[PDB]
Design a protein around this ligand. Sequence first.
Ligand SMILES: [Ca+2]
Ligand SMILES: [Ca+2]
Length: 78
Amino acid sequence: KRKASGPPVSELITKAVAASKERSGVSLAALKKALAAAGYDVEKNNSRIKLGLKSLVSKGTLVQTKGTGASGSFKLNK
DNA sequence: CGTACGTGCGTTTAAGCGGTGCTAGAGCTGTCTACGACCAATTGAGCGGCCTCGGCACCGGGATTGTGAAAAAAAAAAGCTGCA
Ligand SMILES: [Ca+2]
Ligand SMILES: [Ca+2]
């Protein structure tokens, strides 16, 4: 009955947190802190989270509404 | 990407061919009467009509089923640890 709680951590989650936010939103900075809130402070995972972007359009998971140079305002169904 | 098929060879097999010999049975002919058309009178089954009353179509409201997204929780690739 204590503090730590958070995510399931991959493309099951990049699709779940982007959908677990009630509405649309920007960048690596929104998605990672929702994914690292439990206590696992970000170390080497920084390249691993970063990679997910081409992996999502190539495998067809999130369309990006906004964003250019490692920024991406990712969408699901409206 | 792996191998199931096609091609082409030499070897083996029995189909095909002609002939003979045998006789089952196909198919023809004649006779004869059981059987089915045809008939008229008889009459009852099944037709149209007509009435009724319970099954079922439709409704509303509740219980149940099944799908799908998220959130959590087991379970394996991706990183490294000193040992030996
Ligand atoms: Ca005859
Ligand atoms: Ca009737």
